[PDB]
Ligand binder design. Structure first.
Ligand SMILES: [Ca+2]
Ligand SMILES: [Ca+2]
Ligand SMILES: [Ca+2]
Ligand SMILES: [Cl-]
Length: 1380
């Protein structure tokens, strides 16, 4: 037999358990992952009668009557396999980089058992080579709502089929331990109680900031360690790099004598473009000194090249090579570490640095093939990416380390390969957990299956070897390490483990003051006894003082020592540790002002002659208050007012540029230009509030005469800065977030005038790579100068207050306040002086009406081009038209005047414009109020604003007659190609009282219009809910000052007073007013609100006189979704596009080049073939009673053959289509239960299938199980046929809403208090003490109504408001006061 590779086995000390009789034998590991190739030579058991599952037949006996009839035993080794996405039995993936498979690799690492040699000549075995493997193919892609469904199945199926150990590989960054994802936790917890060890990789995100910079020393909460592994039950696995690596190295035969360089290894660089074997047998190395040009006439050409000097990586000190020839190049570090390095490639790789200088012979060179085991350049170091820090709620995770870096394991088709990550360290602890269970299953069968897996964890952890950072000769932080490195031997032999106060092999202490005090308990498992001597190291983060950022390492403070203990036999012994750290406080809190970690280990050696019975337990606490670290970064406004900057803020380009795409905390608003020659038809997008377009169009944060910026919005209707909304850079995970507005005289923020209707939660912005956002904008925090009742809040000075909480159960609410001006008033245009001889135009000094200041005045004329004063510009690629003025600007003299080049345009045609900080702009056209008798001598010129900036009004042509209902709404066509806003106009509404409040232009609101010579005094509109049958409590009311005219004052947009869309359903719209004489009048109407785009059937197509005829299926007219318009049209091509601009009286409007086809008497439409118009330019379109519109090309309505049918699946949620789940997956099965293959989709919806006629079922597979829950049948059956050739299937669901509840107390509670939430219906939700705020008891809960009950001992009471009616996404604090 060939030799065994022990690179990872020597190091984890695994052979110590094999030789004691513990291979994988008689156990089985469930590997939930991406794929296997159960045929691989490694996939084998030695003796099949030693095994848990004994044959293909012991399986079906275990499948059935445990309750499962999918997926099969495949061989003795891979004992169960099922592909839980798509519900199939294709298990192997993937059908250079070929053959690679993640789940194959994972299994290779946990179970054995190759008796053939890999590329090195060695046999590779897993940590438990004699275990059988069930493998669940489960992996996510976000077309679904949530993969949790599929994981829980795989888990439950694992526990029921053959239990033992599950290896998960799954993670969501910065998880919590307590408020994890409930249905997945319970499934994990269920497995523990069945004796299953659940081990989970901890993540590859490393720490907050990891793809940007090291975290600032003010922000200690940089933990990225993932759920579900952050849970208390599972085993969270950090990853250390392998000391030995297996690659395709290099060899310089001339350096074979040099023995610190492996005799030619250098590994390889090869980044981005991996063209190592482009031009690479080889020869002809070179030698280059400087990275300049022609250093010494080069000397390359068909020869590799050599340099550093970090001047310009990958471009100037890379592409400069192919210049002097050389057919390839070779870089070396400028220190000993081997970093990573458009492409601009000939051939290039990075190779060591100690081997750079050793290349000092020119020389010859070869690029090795096959794999040759070489020493890792990252050796005994913690892998860069292994997750760290605490859980989101402040718990010590990970739990243990194991080799994750450059781990050699199994690939498909008898191949092997190296892949790196915490995903790989986890199967090391998977196998190790197999073995330590055999051990306890032999050592104590007097041990229950419910306490078993918690101890396998505790043995592995206490017996771990505390890692020491090589580059720094300091212990690596337990927040990065766990309880240490995996010591398999130590775990199965020592029979000692350690718990702390919490009864866990780790200790999280919460905050700490000056005296760290905690009880440690050592446990004995054998009959013989041990007497051990203990001492504790005490560590904190090291921070670099040049830049003020952590260095992701530690420094030792003082090793305090305690003494010796003597554990009993089959017994415990407690110990008390105590340390005064009051000493180190000044030095540390000066380096880390918001607090620091005080962590470390306590070690246990055998008293006489240590190294026998070496065991440890880790601890961490926080000096400060971990509950109250700042959740958000400070606003870019405050930071820049001081000299500071943001963690992700790019200060590139002009001073004080805050481009809106730039990752800060701040306020965002919408911009819209102001045009004097034509109507503005589109807006300019978001920009940062208080920034303004400077000369070169960069957005600068401009300052008022006192040196401050101004946050001001103008909630007029003009779309220039009408709202403000919060954008955040989050440091910690957030909860409870809302925006509130108070008047600024209300200094304590006790009377909200406006609150954002929703409250928000989310993740820290940890930016671990490009896929992870550095800022998040929450547009649902938009404030628009309206109150909680819809009233306009008057111009003035207000506070916009964004408040939130962290995810720690006792934390106190953090606020963050923005000074905010509402100012809706244009600045003043009075007068100026112009001098025909000097031509100097001087306006009065600049005044504003309102609190926002004047921000800039300008003079401009309209540079006519191609006979028009504006420039209409058509974006062909994005099907968009924009049009703005040709403003050319007159420079402004330092004295505040302009010289007006009257050669370029007349005097009448200059405009003076003054704009303010809130977006109001005044523009006077000089020609207004200018005497025609000019050109003589100084004048006083009157200026008035010309209302160029104004809110647009709907075209209103309507003449009301008595017969008219009085209701009006709007009308618009739905664009098919162009992405401009289709022009809309007012229409009567005397039937079909249905609205689609979707702001598309068409039936969006219900207004009321009165007869023109009738009087409507005190006209108000109130909308009542269907339930409110006495019409007592409006849900929306018109604002004050409404009449028959200004229909906008009566327009109801399907919303509540607070601005949120109402639910689908029907509502009483009541118009009330007083008379000509004095009589009261009340018209009442039933308005019905409905979104939901129509569903378009296939129709059919027949050929008639050699021309295509399309006949649509008969539209149904009943209901709100009944169809009331029906069009077939095509799009003509004019000027080479399918839309068109037309310049009208009003302004410019954009339209599709629609040509309609009449209906024929046989209900068909004749589809002529005409020059340049194909079937993809013919459309069917339908409008419902509500104004909802759908359309499809006629090309898409074919590909439904005349013998085939269509089924469409969708979810029916009782909410507005903008607050709905849309993501789910489904399996369709044919008459025999076989899944359908070879899917054709219909009208471009992945939810609509073309299928042959027959009987079928569909199964709702996955949906967002946290967002919504299913209420209708999960499996629905349907039959397709020529009569029923279109089938709707609908999964009916309800929305889920959660809230957090915290009971905060006066004083601590006596021992023996049991806090619980009492639900209506009487049940008890037990609560537990907060770790950081021990007078707090909190939980996240379903939106409902609860009471806090405590049940104290021997006599005390609680005395406070204990009842709360919970709101969705709110945090409710119920402070409570115990007394005696
Ligand atoms: Ca974390
Ligand atoms: Ca405005
Ligand atoms: Ca609409
Ligand atoms: Cl103003």
């Amino acid at each position: 037999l060939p030799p065994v590779n022990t690179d990872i086995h020597d190091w984890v000390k695994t052979k110590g358990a094999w030789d004691k009789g513990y291979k994988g034998q008689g156990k089985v590991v469930a590997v939930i992952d991406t794929g296997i190739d159960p045929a691989h030579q490694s996939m084998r058991i030695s003796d099949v009668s030693t095994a848990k599952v004994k044959s293909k037949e012991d399986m079906l006996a275990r499948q059935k009557a445990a309750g499962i009839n999918y997926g099969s035993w495949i061989n003795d080794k891979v004992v169960f396999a099922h592909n839980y996405v798509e519900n199939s039995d294709n298990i192997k993936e993937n059908q250079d980089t070929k053959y690679e498979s993640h789940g194959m690799h994972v299994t290779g690492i946990v179970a054995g058992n190759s008796k053939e040699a890999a590329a090195t000549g060695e046999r590779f075995l897993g940590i438990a080579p004699e275990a059988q493997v069930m493998f669940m193919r489960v992996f996510a892609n976000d077309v679904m709502g949530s993969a949790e469904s599929l994981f829980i199945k795989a888990i439950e199926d694992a526990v029921a089929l053959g239990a033992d150990v599950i290896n998960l590989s799954l993670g969501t960054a910065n998880g919590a331990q307590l408020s994890g994802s409930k249905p997945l936790m319970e499934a994990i917890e269920k497995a523990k109680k069945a004796g299953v060890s659940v081990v989970v990789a901890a993540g590859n995100e490393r720490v907050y900031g990891s793809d940007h910079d090291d975290p600032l020393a003010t922000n200690p909460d940089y933990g990225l360690v993932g759920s579900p592994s952050t849970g208390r039950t599972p085993t969270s696995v950090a990853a250390i790099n392998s000391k030995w690596v297996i690659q395709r190295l290099m060899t310089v035969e001339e350096l074979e004598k040099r023995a610190d360089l492996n005799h030619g290894k250098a590994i390889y660089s090869e980044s981005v473009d991996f063209k190592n074997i482009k031009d690479s047998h080889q020869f002809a190395y070179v030698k280059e000194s400087t990275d300049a040009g022609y250093n010494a006439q080069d000397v390359k050409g068909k020869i590799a090249l050599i340099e550093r000097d970090p001047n310009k990586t990958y471009d100037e000190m890379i592409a400069l090579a192919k210049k002097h020839g050389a057919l390839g190049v070779l870089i070396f570090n400028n220190k000993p570490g081997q970093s990573n390095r458009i492409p601009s490639a000939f051939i290039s790789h990075e190779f060591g640095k100690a081997m750079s200088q050793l290349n000092g012979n020119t020389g010859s060179l070869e690029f090795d093939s096959v794999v040759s085991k070489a020493p890792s350049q990252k050796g005994n170091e913690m892998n860069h990416f292994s997750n760290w820090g605490l859980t989101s709620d402040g718990y010590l995770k990970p739990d243990i380390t194991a080799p994750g870096g450059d781990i050699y394991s199994t690939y498909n088709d008898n191949h092997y390969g190296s892949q790196t990550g915490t995903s790989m360290a986890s199967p090391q602890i998977a196998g190790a957990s197999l073995l330590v269970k055999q051990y306890l299953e032999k050592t104590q069968p007097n041990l229950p299956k419910e306490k078993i897996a918690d101890i396998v964890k505790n043995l592995l952890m206490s017996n771990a070897q505390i890692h020491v950072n090589p580059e720094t000769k300091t212990t690596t932080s337990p927040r990065q390490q766990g309880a240490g490195l995996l010591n398999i031997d130590g775990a199965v032999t020592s029979g000692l483990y350690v718990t702390g106060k919490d009864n866990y092999g780790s200790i999280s202490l919460g905050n700490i003051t000056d005296t760290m005090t905690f009880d440690v308990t050592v446990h004995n498992l054998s009959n013989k006894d041990k007497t051990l001597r203990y001492d504790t190291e005490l560590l904190t983060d090291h921070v670099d003082p040049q830049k003020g950022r952590f260095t992701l390492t530690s420094r030792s403070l003082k090793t305090y020592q305690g003494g010796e203990v003597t554990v009993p036999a089959n017994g415990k012994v407690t110990v008390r540790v105590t340390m005064d750290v009051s000493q180190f406080t000044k030095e540390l809190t000066k380096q880390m002002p918001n607090g620091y970690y005080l962590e470390g280990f306590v070690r246990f050696r055998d008293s006489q002659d240590d190294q026998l019975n070496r065991v440890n337990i880790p601890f961490v606490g926080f000096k400060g208050q971990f509950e109250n670290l700042a959740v958000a970064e400070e606003s870019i406004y405050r930071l820049k007012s001081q000299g500071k900057t943001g963690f992700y803020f790019d200060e590139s380009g002009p001073k004080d540029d805050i481009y809106v795409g730039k990752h800060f905390t701040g306020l965002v608003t919408l911009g819209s230009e102001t045009n004097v020659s034509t109507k503005t038809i589109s807006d300019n997008g978001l920009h940062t509030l208080g920034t303004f377009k400077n000369a070169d169009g960069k957005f600068i944060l401009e300052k008022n005469a006192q040196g401050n910026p101004v946050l001001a919005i103008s909630p007029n209707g003009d779309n220039n800065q009408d709202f403000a909304a919060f954008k955040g850079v989050f440091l910690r995970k957030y909860q409870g977030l809302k925006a509130s507005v108070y008047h600024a005289s209300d200094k304590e923020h006790k009377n909200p005038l406006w609150v954002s209707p929703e409250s928000f939660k989310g993740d820290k912005n940890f930016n671990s790579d490009i896929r992870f956002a550095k800022s998040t904008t929450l547009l649902g925090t938009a404030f628009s100068g309206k109150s909680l009742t819809g009233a306009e809040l008057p111009d003035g000075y207000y506070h916009y207050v964004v408040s939130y909480y962290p995810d720690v159960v006792g934390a106190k609410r953090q606020e963050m306040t923005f000074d905010m001006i509402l100012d809706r008033q244009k600045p003043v245009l009075s007068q100026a002086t112009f001098d025909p001889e000097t031509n100097r135009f001087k306006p009065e000094p600049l005044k504003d009406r309102g609190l926002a200041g004047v921000r800039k005045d300008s003079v401009f004329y309209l540079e006519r081009k191609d006979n028009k004063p504006y420039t209409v510009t058509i974006n062909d690629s994005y099907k968009y038209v924009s049009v703005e003025d040709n403003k050319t600007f007159v420079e402004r003299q330092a004295d505040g005047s302009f010289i007006l080049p009257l050669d370029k345009a007349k005097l009448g045609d200059f405009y003076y414009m003054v704009e303010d900080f809130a977006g109001n702009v005044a523009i006077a056209k000089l020609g207004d109020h200018l005497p025609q008798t000019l050109g003589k001598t100084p004048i006083k010129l009157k200026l008035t604003d010309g209302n160029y900036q104004t809110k647009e009004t709907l075209k209103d042509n309507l003449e009301m007659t008595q017969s008219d209902t009085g209701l009006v709404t709007n009308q618009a066509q739905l664009a098919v190609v162009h992405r401009n806003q289709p022009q809309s106009q007012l229409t009567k509404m005397n039937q079909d009282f249905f609205i689609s409040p979707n702001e598309d232009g068409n039936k969006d609101f219900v207004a009321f219009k009165g007869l023109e010579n009738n009087v409507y005094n005190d006209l108000t509109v109130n909308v009542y809910a269907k339930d409110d049958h006495q019409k007592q409590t409006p849900i929306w009311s018109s604002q004050a000052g409404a009449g028959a005219s200004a229909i906008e004052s009566t327009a109801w947009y399907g919303i509540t007073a607070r601005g949120s869309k109402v639910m689908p359903g029907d509502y009483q719209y009541v118009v009330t007013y007083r008379d000509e004489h004095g009589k009261e009048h009340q018209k009442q109407y039933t308005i019905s609100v409905n979104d939901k785009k129509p569903m378009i059937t296939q129709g059919r197509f027949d050929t008639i006189n050699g021309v295509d005829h399309f006949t649509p299926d008969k539209t149904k007219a009943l209901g709100s979704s009944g169809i009331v318009r029906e069009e077939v049209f095509y799009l003509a091509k004019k000027n080479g596009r399918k839309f068109d601009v037309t310049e009208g009286k009003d302004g410019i409007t954009v339209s599709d080049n629609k040509v309609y086809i009449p209906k024929n008497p046989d209900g068909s439409y004749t589809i002529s073939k005409r020059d340049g118009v194909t079937l993809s330019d013919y459309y069917y379109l339908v409008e419902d009673r509500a104004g909802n519109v759908s359309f499809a090309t006629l090309r898409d309505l074919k590909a439904v053959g005349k013998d085939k049918a269509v089924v469409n699946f969708g979810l029916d949620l009782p909410v507005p289509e903008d607050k709905q789940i849309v993501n789910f997956t489904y399996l369709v099965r044919d008459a025999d239960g076989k899944p359908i293959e070879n899917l054709e989709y219909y009208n471009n919806s992945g939810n609509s299938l073309i299928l042959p006629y027959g009987k079928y079922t569909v199964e709702l597979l996955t949906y967002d199980t946290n967002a919504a829950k299913l209420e209708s049948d999960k499996i629905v059956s349907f039959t397709l046929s020529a009569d029923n050739n279109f089938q709707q299937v609908t999964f009916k669901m309800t929305m889920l809403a959660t809230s957090q509840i915290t009971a905060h107390f006066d004083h601590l509670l006596p021992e023996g208090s049991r806090v619980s939430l009492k639900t209506a219906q009487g049940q008890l939700i037990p609560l537990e003490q907060s770790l950081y705020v021990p007078k707090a008891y909190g939980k996240t809960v379903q939106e409902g109504t609860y009471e806090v009950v405590v049940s104290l001992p021997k006599g005390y009471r609680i005395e406070g408001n204990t009842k709360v009616n919970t709101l969705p996404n709110e945090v409710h604090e119920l402070s409570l006061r115990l007394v005696k």
